[PDB]
Every structure is written in C-alpha cells, then in structure tokens.
Amino acid sequence: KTVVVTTILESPYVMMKKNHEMLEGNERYEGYCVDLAAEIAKHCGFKYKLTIVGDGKYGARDADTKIWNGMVGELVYGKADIAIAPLTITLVREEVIDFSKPFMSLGISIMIKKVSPIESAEDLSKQTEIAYGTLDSGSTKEFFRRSKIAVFDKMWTYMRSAEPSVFVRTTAEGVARVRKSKGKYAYLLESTMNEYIEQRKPCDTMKVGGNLDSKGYGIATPKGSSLGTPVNLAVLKLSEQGVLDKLKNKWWYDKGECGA
Amino acid sequence: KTVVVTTILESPYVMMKKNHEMLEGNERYEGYCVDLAAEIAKHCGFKYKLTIVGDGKYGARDADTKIWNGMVGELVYGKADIAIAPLTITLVREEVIDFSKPFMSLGISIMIKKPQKSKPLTVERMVSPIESAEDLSKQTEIAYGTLDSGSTKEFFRRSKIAVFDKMWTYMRSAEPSVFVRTTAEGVARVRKSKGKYAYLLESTMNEYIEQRKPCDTMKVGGNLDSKGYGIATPKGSSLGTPVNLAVLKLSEQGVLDKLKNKWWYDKGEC
Amino acid sequence: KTVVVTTILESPYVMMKKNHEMLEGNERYEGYCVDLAAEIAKHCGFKYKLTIVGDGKYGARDADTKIWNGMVGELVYGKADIAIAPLTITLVREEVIDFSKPFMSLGISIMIKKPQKSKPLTVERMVSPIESAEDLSKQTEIAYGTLDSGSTKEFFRRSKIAVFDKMWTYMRSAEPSVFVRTTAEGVARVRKSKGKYAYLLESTMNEYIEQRKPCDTMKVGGNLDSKGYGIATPKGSSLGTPVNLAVLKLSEQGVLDKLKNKWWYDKGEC
Amino acid sequence: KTVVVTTILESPYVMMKKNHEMLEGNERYEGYCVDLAAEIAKHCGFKYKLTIVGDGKYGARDADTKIWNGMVGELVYGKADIAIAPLTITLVREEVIDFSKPFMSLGISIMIKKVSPIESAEDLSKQTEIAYGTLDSGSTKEFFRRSKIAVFDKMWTYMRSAEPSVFVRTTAEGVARVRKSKGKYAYLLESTMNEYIEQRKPCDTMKVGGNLDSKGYGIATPKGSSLGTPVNLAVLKLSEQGVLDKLKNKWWYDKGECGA
Ligand SMILES: NS(=O)(=O)c1cc2c(cc1Cl)N[C@H]([C@H]1C[C@H]3C=C[C@@H]1C3)NS2(=O)=O
Ligand SMILES: NS(=O)(=O)c1cc2c(cc1Cl)N[C@H]([C@H]1C[C@H]3C=C[C@@H]1C3)NS2(=O)=O
Ligand SMILES: NS(=O)(=O)c1cc2c(cc1Cl)N[C@H]([C@H]1C[C@H]3C=C[C@@H]1C3)NS2(=O)=O
Ligand SMILES: NS(=O)(=O)c1cc2c(cc1Cl)N[C@H]([C@H]1C[C@H]3C=C[C@@H]1C3)NS2(=O)=O
Ligand SMILES: N[C@@H](CCC(=O)O)C(=O)O
Ligand SMILES: N[C@@H](CCC(=O)O)C(=O)O
Ligand SMILES: N[C@@H](CCC(=O)O)C(=O)O
Ligand SMILES: N[C@@H](CCC(=O)O)C(=O)O
C-alpha cells in the first residue's frame, strides 16, 4: 500500500520547492523533515506520499470538547499514518499517540530584536514594559498553562490576560511581529527555530539567555500502529550513524546566510 | 510485590553516604538516581529496593558468545525489573530492552589534564594541546581511551565516520591498553598521566568531575554526538509505560531541572 | 461562623486587583495582608470575609469625646473580630485591644523628593538638604507633616524628647496644615511640593514607594524609633492566642520574610 | 512581698560590676537588663531581688523527658516570678510561659575573625572548609533543628553530625573559640551580642552577611501570672518613652572601646 504522511510547512523542516508549480509528488517538497521522511521510508521499505495538514496547527485540545486538531488530530482520527514534523514530545500527546525517540533536542527560547536588557526569563517576567507571546495550539502555550513554578505561572497569567491577544497564528507571523515591533515584542518559541531564524537574513533577531527547559521533537504514529517500533529503530539508527547530525548541519549551518 | 531497581555506582548519580556503615536499605545511597527512583515511586506507587549490579558494568555484547552482560544483561534475563541509572539509549540495547524517554541529555566529550597558565602584560591565558576530535586523532603524543563495555566504546566500534573510524582503529591496537574499567579509573589515569592521556566519557560526568575539587582536569572541544539517559525495562513489562509517563511528568514539572542543578552546581567549588 | 477580618487600603498590603469589577469575595484584593490572612486561616481554620473600613483610618481616640475611631475603634465596639493590617502596636491601643507578637518590623522615617544629581571629574553625586530629624527641626524652609489619626502622629504628640517635642510644636500650629488624611495624599504632596515638604511615614511603606516607579522620592537618615505591626483582636477574645501562635509559626517558618521579599523587593521597578 | 528575678550572666545585659566583693543585694549587679529590671520595678511598684539561674541555660527541653531547664525551667516550676534577660520569643517557649512584647529586635548572625570569603549563609553552608556552631540550649539551635528550608536543613545536619561537638557551653566560650581558631571557626549567635562583641577590644571579631531571620527578646513570666499585663505595659511605655533606646545606646555605643 501507500503511507500517507502529514506534516506542517515549517522551515527548514518542510519547504515548498522553488519550482513547485511545475512539480508533483514528493519532488515538490524539500527540507530536514522531507529528508527524514525519505530516509525513514528507505530504512522501513515503504512508499510514502507527503501531505500537509489542512490546518497549520501542530496539535492541542480544544475548548472543553476533547477534539484533537492539527497533526495529532490527523493521526488519532485515522486521516494519516505517520507524522514526520517538528512535533514536541509532551505528556498530553503521549497519552493519545506513541512518540519515537527524540531526533532533535531543544528548549524554550526567548527571541528579541537586535546591553541585553531582558537577559534571563526572570528579568523578562519581572518587567512589564516589553511584551511576549507564544504559538497557539503548540507545546509552548500548553507548557506555560500547565506550569506550576511561580515565575512561569505568573508569565502565563500575564499572557492569558493580554489586551490585545498576544498569541500568533504561525511562528512566521511571530517573527514578523517581533521584527516590526521596534524592540517592544518578544517571541517565545523553540530554540531550533530561533537559531534558524537568527542565522538567516536580515539577522535582525537574536536569542537571549538560556533554554527554560529541555524537550525534543518526535515522530508520531497512531496509537497501537505497526510502524511504531520500525520508525523508532530507524530514528535510533539514523542518530547512531550521524545522519541526523549531518542533516541538521546541512539545513541549519551549511548555508549560513549571515555574518557570524 | 516490591520492585528490584538495579543501579550502578557513579557520581553524582549514586554515592554511598558517610554514615552507611550502620545505615541499611534505601537510605544507604545518596545522589541523583536515588532521588529519581524516589520520584518514580511517588508517581506510580511501589516499594523499591535499590541494588547494585555485581559486574559493575553498564552492559555490552561479549565476543562470539552472544551473551548480554552488565546492567542491561542482568535486566534482560529477569533478575531485575527496572534500571534507574545513567544508562545510554542505543540501537543495540533497544532491540533487547524497552527504553523510556530520556531524562537527561548527554554527549561524548574529551577529558584532559588541565594545563598551567602560560604567562607571556601580566595576563594569564589557557592554552591546550587538543582542541577537537580531529586533531586528537591526527596527533600521537597524547593517548586516548574509552570505558570498557560502555556506550562510547560501542559507538566508536560501529562508527563509519572517517575520523571516528581512525580513532577506533588506533584504540583497537593500542599497546598497552587505553581502555579502562571504571570512570574513576580513567579520571585517575588522566590525573596521574601528566597530560599524556585523554579520557572519552559523557559530558555530564565530565562536568561533574571538572566542577569538584581538586579540579585539575578540563573538557575540551564540543560534544562528539548527542544522546540521552533513559530508564530501562525488559521487553513487554507492565512497568515500561508507567515509568515513561513518570519521566515525562517529571520533565514537565521541572523536578529534573532542580535535581540536576542541586546535584551538579550547588555542590561545586573552585 | 464566618469571621470578619477588617483591613485598611494600603499598598502593598491590600490593593484591589485589576479585574476586580467582576470579582467578589476574597479575590478583589491582592498584596501582603490578604495572603497573611489566608495563612492565618490555614493555620487556625475559619472562614474569613475581608472588609475595608468605612472611614479609612488606622485608629485614634479623639480627646474630650473618648470615642475610638478607625480600625481600632471599630474593633473595640464589636463590629469586627480581627484586624489583619499594618496596625502599629502602641501603649494606648494595648489598653483597649489585645495585640499579637509583631509580624513586621518598622520605624518612623522621612520621605523627601529626590534631588537632581550634582554635576561635578565627571562623577554624579547625590546631595540632600536634610539627613536627620534634628536638622529637620532646626530648619524652616521645608515643611514636615504626618498622617492624621495614625501611630506616628500620636507618637510625636506624646513625645517628651526635646527634638521630637520641637517637631510636634511646629506641627500642631502650622498654617496651612501639614497633616494628611491618606498615605498616598502625603506622597503626592511630597512629589508635587518640589522639595519643600518632607513626609513622616513608616519605613516599610517608604521603602515600597522608593522601589517603585516613578521613584522620584528617597528616604533620609535612619528610623526615629523601633516599632512593629501586630494583628489586633478585641479585649478578652478567643481568637487572640491562636492568632499569636499562628504569627509565631509563620515567623519561624520563613513565610513572613518570603512574603515581604516577594511583595517588596521582587517587583522593584527602579 | 518580694519578687525573685532570674537572669543570666550575659554582657552587656547583666554584669557583675568590678568591686562586687564588698557589695550585696541588687547593688552588686549592673547592665542593660539590670536597668530594665529597675525601670520595671519602678513602673509596677514592687521590690525585687536579682538572682542568677544556677546553670547558665536560657531554656530548652531535655532528651525526651519534657523537663524545662534554665530560666524557662526556673519559671514553669515556680522557682522564679519573672525573667528579665535576653530570652528569645519562640513558638515552643510561648506555649509554656507568658512573653511580653519584644524590647529588643534582633536576628541570627555570623561572626568570624577579622573581604570575607563566606559573607552570606549560602556560601558558609556550601563551603565545608569553614566550621560553624551555635549555643547549646538556646534558640538558634532550636531554630536550625526545627527549620524546613533546604539550606538551614543542610547546616543543621552538618552541625549535629560534627566531630568533635561544635556546640559551645557559653557564648563567651564561643567568642574565645572563634578568636583562637585563627579564622577557622564561625559562630552563629544573636545579632546584638555579635555587635557588642565586635565593638569591644581587641576588635578581632567581625560580623558578615545579613540576618538569617528576625526575632526579639521578651520578658517571661509564669503562665497565668498577675504580672504579665503590668510588665507588658511597662515594656510598651519604656519603648514609647525612648528608655529602651537610651539604655541600648548607653550599654552598646556610648563606651565603644574600638577603632571606628
Ligand atoms: N544535535 S541534534 O539536536 O540534531 C540531535 C539530538 C538528538 C539526537 C540526535 C541529534 Cl543529531 N538523538 C537522541 C536519541 C538517540 C538516542 C539517545 C537519545 C535519543 C535516543 N535524541 S536527541 O538527544 O534529541
Ligand atoms: N537539562 S537535562 O540534561 O537535565 C534534561 C534533558 C532532557 C529532559 C529534561 C532535562 Cl532536565 N527531557 C527530555 C524528554 C522530554 C520530552 C521530550 C524529550 C524527552 C521526552 N529528554 S532530554 O532532552 O534528554
Ligand atoms: N523581616 S520582617 O520585617 O518581614 C519580620 C519581622 C518580625 C518577625 C519576622 C519577620 Cl520576617 N518576627 C518577630 C516576632 C517573632 C518572635 C520574636 C519577636 C516577635 C515574636 N517580630 S518582628 O521582629 O516584627
Ligand atoms: N532598637 S532596639 O533593638 O533596642 C528596640 C526594638 C524594639 C523595641 C524597642 C527597641 Cl529600643 N520595641 C518594640 C515593641 C514596642 C511596641 C511595638 C513593637 C513591640 C511592641 N519591639 S522591637 O521592634 O523588637
Ligand atoms: N513544534 C511545537 C510547536 C512550536 C511552538 O510551540 O513554539 C509543537 O509541536 O508543539
Ligand atoms: N553512560 C554509558 C556508560 C559510560 C561510558 O560508556 O563512558 C552507558 O550507559 O552506556
Ligand atoms: N501603621 C500606622 C499608620 C501609618 C502612619 O501613621 O504613618 C498605624 O497603625 O497607626
Ligand atoms: N539568647 C538566646 C540564646 C542565644 C542563642 O541561641 O544564640 C535565647 O534566649 O534563647
């Protein structure tokens, strides 16, 4: 048969090809996650057709309806068979889908515009002059919402009671908003996306401080799927062989369109 | 039924307490892994008796006998139910045991004896003979060796990268042996080798040794790779999913961060 | 039975929350006294309903009428059971109500408008015209006043110390009046008087005002005396001893100092 | 009737004068506490005879026998009627005796031999090279024993399991030990005593850091004594009239036999 793959258009994970208008199939996509999917298919021995989730959402639970949206919803409801994408491994997701071993480690990073007046997240929370937000339906808003530490809890209480809404639809919109905020907005996103953005033109953004915690991206499958252990072994073998590191260097540091 | 929890001797993971001559049971040990086991028991309720692997090894495959030894080996054959220890997740181990999500990140790092400051106006600067793994492999004045029956030895044995392949080729026929039996043995060799030996170990243990007295060693270069420490469990056991969710919950709460901070930095000096 | 806990509107002890127009009960207020009362309830279990005094005065007995007004007055006449607020322990108040062990050390300090920096090779220096209370009594270009119906005013009125007697003698006959009705009124008077008014207030509120924006005021000298804030209780009541024991418990448990640190210094805008 | 006043030989609270061998009665004692007792007797209108507790113990509970020793024991068992002395107001003591309002604020401080390498208590606890102890049968030891904060717990666990016993019989012995330790000993004692010691010859001791907590000294009477309200009123009147301030200035800073 064929394996339907869901993923989200995120750089440098999945990108539309420069000549994607005249291209069909898996040849119209490129990126770290596209290469990961190709290598996973090579190791397992299955034919795959890349698809983009209809709603550009990673996955969360809606307002008191217990409905999964985005890629996780695409998995639990049978619309997809695998999800090679930057999906963070979390408590809530692991209960409804099975995660592979992390293929990329990351944490929570603060993005600002180019003395470092913000520095640590503690100083960011103690000061109400500069604003900060996150990505809706991700693993950042749900991390702050369920946090029990006082500083993260008070950050979340600020962000939820924000006028206007501080959350952004896409991390690209968050990057644009912090770029056009004249140093008045901060974006709380994953460290890998922060590094990729700060390593590209116009190099107007930079990551400040350290990671608030440590998480990872996993490859998700429907609960109780035959693909679980094969894709877990594929991820482990790719990590052992250095293919994951080589792909990360290729899509993060090989180009390096910035002065650093 | 009480749960047998195999664990190895390693700092700051597990340390015998000062007053352990008369103390008996769970209170004998102290460190990181004991607190992790206590938190795991708190999450999913069971009674756990902390034991130590007799062989004192993390685990590997023997030569031509196809027998698993070490902590992983004794977990496979059933004399233990769960390994709450600095056990590294690998492909060969996953094929025989069930690993959980990593609870602490790590990489392969290099330990060398800390050189003396080189005065040349009156400024002291740190200079080192080894900067990366490539120049460590190119040179021959300084010998380098890994830990026997560990994750790093297996990684170098099965590495197809040219530089790592060359390091393994040197290590295989190094006379006398560059391999050690314990992390403490390798650290002592680095100490009383006058800079002629370099130890390849995990970044976590490297940092712990560097931050504690006499702190005459230092870590050079970056991390050769990226791995993690998981909680091991035999195939098909009923404890695997509970400990996986427990590790996820502890990561979410921040308990792991506080444990690492209190057992790695709050007790450091120099 | 639900206990009625009276409190005054004073920052950072009790301040109305931002979303307090749709809120009711013990959720409109936030600060130090609110969670102090929460801790008191959690120690000795009861139901407490926070109230604000109608006349907004701490407490004083008017001469020739012999009627107590303020928090102390309304606690005396049985319309409240416990006062959890910045109420200062005094001799006149102890003869009519039962105080507890102090939970907050305090002193009488001076508030002045912060002067501009002195220009002179390029260093900036802070020069103030008033440092102690003696030179405040000696000078006449800067007026000084206290809070009406407060501990400080009665302290200055009853003081037989020569310098404090002179300060009271000036204060009693001053045209226009140097006394203020609210603490915020005195702070606004200091901020708008352009350095020609010094406000005599407790050190805790003085430091809280100093640490916050727009931070254009500064405290000079040391405290004129040593006093404390106690939780009040009507004479011969059953809540006095449990309140005293709860205050001692919180003091020895580090809760009081942590609350002070996280309500006074953590949110330091300047 | 006469009133028996128990107190401890502590400077500058109670001294034994200098030509005491030819003196009898209350005229052979001097100090801050002697003046305080005289003022209390003047206010209440009673005749008092100063006595020194047989053992120089402030007060605590023995090894699982529920016997009070020292001044507190001298009060609960009826051997004394009032205790004008530097007795710290504590939770355990208040349950057995009546404490007046504090007549002197204070806290727990660190003293060492004359930039300090430890300064704060965090560094004092972290560094095992430097040693520190308290006064036996006091309130600082009971503060550390019953504490729940991590750093105070660590300090207490160190001090109890000390070879040899780090505790001292008298605070004078603690001062002598810290002076004779060549800077290898630290003393955890009350801030007022530390200041008095550091303001005296030979000025070889200094106080570092802040105060770990804040407490006060109270005047203790047996539970349900007729004197409790009069002595509380006397303390309040003395505090309001500045008599306590004057006495502390007289016995702490008026002489000041040190270079400052
Ligand atoms: N350097 S990196 O972020 O691209 C990266 C990060 C990671 C990799 C591999 C790479 Cl290349 N593999 C590990 C996995 C491998 C085995 C050990 C830990 C998990 C299971 N997870 S990780 O520590 O999140
Ligand atoms: N900072 S650290 O090394 O102590 C550390 C390292 C890691 C932590 C948590 C901590 Cl505190 N959790 C992650 C786990 C959380 C979820 C995402 C990846 C795994 C599943 N593994 S990790 O990336 O190996
Ligand atoms: N540092 S502070 O002002 O928040 C503060 C002030 C004080 C505290 C405790 C704290 Cl945390 N406890 C004391 C009390 C405790 C026991 C000893 C004196 C009284 C009874 N009163 S205090 O000296 O007024
Ligand atoms: N400056 S001092 O340490 O000698 C000092 C300390 C204190 C004094 C008086 C003096 Cl002189 N009185 C107060 C008491 C007076 C009234 C207000 C608080 C208690 C009841 N306690 S205190 O704040 O502990
Ligand atoms: N990759 C994240 C989304 C990015 C973010 O939350 O910032 C997730 O899977 O939830
Ligand atoms: N931590 C490693 C062993 C140590 C080493 O190989 O250096 C493991 O779990 O296999
Ligand atoms: N805290 C004082 C009021 C403040 C003041 O007078 O400055 C009291 O209880 O009377
Ligand atoms: N003076 C203290 C004892 C001294 C100390 O513990 O440091 C008391 O009355 O308990």
What residue type is assigned to position D252 of the chain? W
Q: Which chains touch B (3 or more CB pairs under 8 A)?
A: A, D
Q: How far is the CA of B11 from the centre of ligand 5 (A)?
A: 35
Q: What Cα–Cα distance (Å) separates residue D147 from each residue in C253, D127, D142, D213?
A: 7, 20, 8, 11
Q: How close is the Cα of C150 to the center of ligand 7, in Å? A: 4
Cα distance between residue B116 and residue A79, in whole Å: 63
Chain B residue with Cα closest to D161: B19
Question: D12: buried, middle or exposed (CB in 10 Å: 19+, 13-18, 0-12)?
Answer: buried
Residue C187 to residue A203: CA distance in whole angstroms: 47
Report the relative pairing of strands A2-7 and A47-52 from DSSP bridges.
parallel
Nearest-CB residue to B105 (from A99, A147, A214): A214
- Which residues lie with the beta carbon below 6 Å from any ligand 8 atom? D 58, 86-88, 135, 138-140, 189-190
Instruction: Provide DSSP, C179-197.
Output: -BSSHHHHHHHHHHTTTSE
Omega before residue B120 within 30° of 0, cis: no
Query: What is the whole-number distance in angstroms between the Cα of residue A87 and the centre of ligand 5?
Result: 6
Q: D101, D108, D144: best mutation site toward chain C, by most C Cβ within 10 Å? A: D101
Q: Which two tokens stand for residue D129?
A: 């090279």
CA nearest to A50, candidates A69, A30, A77, A21:
A30
Q: How far apart are CA C13 and CA C205, in angstroms?
A: 9
Sheet with A108-113, edge to edge strand ranges: A131-133, A185-190, A108-113, A205-208
Task: Tell me the C-alpha distance between B270 and A91, whole Å.
Answer: 39
How many angstroms separate the CA atoms of C82 and C6, rounded? 6
- The residue among B59, B37, B58, B39 whose CA lies nearest residue B48 is B37
Name the binding residues of D for L-glutamate. 86, 88, 93, 139-140, 190
Indicate the SS3 state at residue C82. Answer: strand
* Residues on chain C touching A126 (C-beta within 8 angstroms): 266-268
Residue D19 has a CB neighbour count (10 Å cut-off) of 7
Tokens of A49: 């057709």
CA of A201 to the centre of ligand 5 (A): 23
The Cα C51–Cα C68 span in angstroms is 18
Render A181-233 in DSSP notation, one character per residue: TTS-EEEEEEHHHHHHHHTSTT--EEEES--SS-EEEEEEEETT-TTHHHHHH
Judge if the upstream peptide bond of residue B115 is cis by omega within 30 degrees of 0. no
| Cβ burial, residue D8 (10 Å; 0-12/13-18/19+) | buried
**B225: CA distance to ligand 1 center in Å?**
8
CA distance B36 to B18: 20
DSSP secondary structure, A7-57, as one string: E---TTTSEE-TT-SS--GGGGEESHHHHHHHHHHHHHT-EEEEEE-SS--
* Expt. technique: cryo-EM
Distance CA D43, CA B95 (A): 87
The atom number, within ligand 5, closest to the CA of A140 reads 6
Could you write out the DSSP letters of every residue in D98-146? EE---SEEEEEEEEEE---SS-SHHHHHH-SSSEEE-BTTSSHHHHHHT
Backbone angles phi, psi at D145, to 5 degrees: -65, -45
Residue C191 is encoded by which pair of tokens? 């901020």
**Do residues B113 and B216 lie in contact, with contact meaning Cβ atoms separated by under 8 Å?**
yes
Nearest C-alpha neighbor of C129 from the set C147, C108, C144:
C144
Chain D nearest-CA distance from C81, in A, is: 21
Q: Which contiguous run of DSSP H or E holds residue D235? A: helix D228-240
Residues with CB under 6 A from ligand 7: C 58-59, 86-88, 147, 150-152, 201-202
Please give the structure tokens belonging to residue A119.
């520095």
Distance of alpha carbon B39 from alpha carbon A157, whole angstroms: 28
φ, ψ (nearest 5 deg) of residue C59:
150, 135
Number of helices (H), then strands (E), belonging to chain C: the values are 10, 15
Phi-psi region of B227 (alpha: psi -120 to 50; beta: other; left: phi over 0): beta
Provide φ and ψ at B201, rounded to 5°.
-145, -175
Neighbours of C233 (CB within 10 A): 23
Residue C195 one-letter amino acid: G
Q: Chain D: nearest CA to C102, how far in angstroms? A: 8
Interatomic CA distance for residues A61 and A41, integer angstroms: 30
Q: Which two tokens stand for residue A256?
A: 């390096």
Secondary structure tally for chain A: helices H, strands E: 10, 12
Query: Helix, strand, coil: what percent of chain D each, to 5?
Result: 35, 25, 40
Q: Which among C136, C244, A138, A24 has a CA at the least distance from the CA of D101?
A: C244
User: Which residue ranges have their beta carbon within 6 Å of ligand 5?
Assistant: A 58, 86-88, 135, 138-140, 189-190
Residue A93 assigned as binding residue: yes
* Residue D259: how many other CB atoms lie within 10 Å: 6
Residue type, B254: G
**What is the rounded distance in angstroms from the CA atom of residue C255 to the CA atom of residue C252?**
8
Reading the block at residue A197, the tokens are 């953005």
CB atoms near residue C37 (< 10 Å): 22
Closest CA to A109 of A32, A200, A186: A186
Report how far residue B174's alpha carbon sits from residue B181's, in angstroms, rounded to the nearest whole number. 16
Q: Three-state SS for A112?
A: strand
D25 - beta bridge partners?
none
- On whether the CB atoms of residues C39 and C255 are closer than 8 A, the answer is yes
* Residues of B contacting chain D (CB within 8 angstroms): 19, 266-267, 269
Q: Which residues of chain B make contact with D126, given a CB cutoff of 8 A? A: 266-267, 269
What is the per-residue DSSP string for B57-103? ----B-TTT--B-HHHHHHHTTS-SEEEEEEEP-HHHHTTEEE---S
Q: Cα separations (Å) of D246 from C167, D35, D250? A: 20, 11, 6
* Inter-CA distances, A214 with B43, B103, B237, D219, Å: 20, 9, 28, 55
Cα distances (angstroms) measured from residue D204 to each of C26, C33, D108, D179, D200? 54, 43, 20, 7, 9
Helices (H), chain C: 32-43, 70-76, 91-94, 134-138, 151-158, 162-172, 183-192, 203-211, 240-252, 255-264
Residue nearest to atom 9 of ligand 8 (CA): D87
Give phi and psi for C228, each to the nearest 5: -150, 165
Q: Do C101 and D105 touch (CB under 8 A)?
A: no
DSSP single-letter state for residue B22 = T
C176 prior amide bond cis, ω within 30: yes
Does A140 carry a binding-site annotation? yes
Q: Tokens standing for A171? A: 């991390």
Residue B107: closest CA among B206, B229, B223, B199: B223
B97-99/B217-220 β-pairing: unpaired
Structure token pair of residue D203: 């000025």
Residues 6+ apart with CB under 8 A from D147: C254, D153, D156
- Reduced to 3 states (helix: H, G, I; strand: E, B; else coil), residue C158 is helix
Please state, in angstroms and as integers, the Cα–Cα distance from residue D227 to each residue in A207, C118, C122, D44, following that order. 67, 57, 63, 9
Comparing C-alpha atoms, which of D104, D101, D105 is closest to residue D233?
D101
> Which residue in this structure is represented by tokens 């640190």?
C261
Closest CA to D74 of D84, D65, D88: D84
Compute the Cα dihedral for B152, B158, B161, B162 and give only its sign.
positive
The span from the CA of A201 to the CA of B112, in Å, is: 39
DSSP at A164: S
Query: Going from the N-terminus, what domains does chain B have, and what CATH number goes with each?
Result: 3-105+228-264 (3.40.190.10), 108-220 (3.40.190.10)
DSSP reduced 3-state for B7 = strand
Q: How far is C212 from chain A (nearest CA, A)?
A: 12
Which residues in chain D touch residue C161, judged by CB atoms under 8 angstroms apart? Answer: 242
Task: Tell me the C-alpha distance between D168 and D133, whole Å.
Answer: 8
Quote the CA–CA distance of D231 and D98 in Å, as a whole number.
10
**CA-to-CA distance for D33 and D42, rounded, in angstroms?**
14
For residue C176, say whether it is annotated as part of any ligand binding site.
Answer: no
Give Cβ neighbours of residue B85 (< 8 Å, ≥ 6 apart).
B6, B7, B8, B10, B13, B14, B33, B58, B71, B232
Q: How far apart are CA A133 and CA A169, in angstroms?
A: 11
For residue A173, give Cα distances in angstroms to A177, A180, A187, A199, B255.
6, 10, 10, 18, 33
Q: What's the CA gap between B186 and B148, in Å, rounded?
A: 10
Tell me which residue of D121, D113, D56 sits closest to D85, measured CA to CA: D56
Sheet holding C217-220, edge to edge: C143-145, C197-202, C108-113, C217-220
Residue where the block lists tokens 């800390």: B114
Write the DSSP assignment of D46-63 as a string of letters.
-EEEEEE-SS-----B-S
Helix-helix angle A243-252:A32-44, to 10 degrees:
160
What percent of chain A is helix, strand and coil (3-state, nearest 5)?
A: 35, 25, 40
Question: H or E element: which one contains A91?
Answer: helix A91-94
Of the candidates B46, B34, B26, B25, the residue with the CA atom closest to the CA atom of residue B84: B34
- Determine the 3-state secondary structure of D7 from DSSP: strand
D207 vs D114: CA distance, rounded Å = 9
φ, ψ for residue D220, nearest 5 deg: -100, 140
Best mutation site among A72, A135, A197 for ligand 5 pocket (most ligand atoms within 8 Å of CB): A135
Output the CA A120–ligand 6 centroid distance in Å: 33
Looking at beta carbons, which pairs linking D67-70 to residues 24 or more positions away fall under 8 Å? D68/D96, D69/D137, D70/D8, D70/D137
D214 beta partners:
D107
As a dihedral over the C-alpha atoms of residue C73, residue C79, residue C82, residue C86, rounded to 10 degrees, the angle is -40
- CA–CA gap between residue B89 and residue B227 (Å, rounded): 7
Burial D232-255 (b: 16+ CB within 10 A, else e): bbbbbebbbbbbbeebbeebeeee
> Which residue numbers of D have CB closer than 8 Å to C's CBs?
89-91, 94-95, 99, 101-102, 105, 143, 146-149, 213-216, 232-233, 236-237, 239-242, 245
DSSP code, position C117:
P
Contact predicate D241/D138, CB 8 Å: no
* Residue A122 annotated as binding site: no
Site from C27, C35, C264, C266 to mutate, A interface, most A CB atoms within 10 angstroms = C266
Instruction: Tell me if A44 sits within 8 A of A235, measured CB to CB.
Output: no
C161: left (phi over 0), alpha (psi -120 to 50) or beta: beta
Find the angle CA(D112)-CA(D113)-CA(D116) to the nearest 5 degrees: 70
Q: Which of C194, C9, C11 is nearest to C114 (CA)?
A: C194
Nearest to D190 by CA among D162, D217, D169: D217
Residues in contact with A45: Cβ distance below 8 Å, sequence separation at least 6, in sequence order = none
Q: Do D108 and D216 contact (CB within 8 A), yes or no?
A: no
Chain C residues touching residue D95 (CB < 8 angstroms): 245
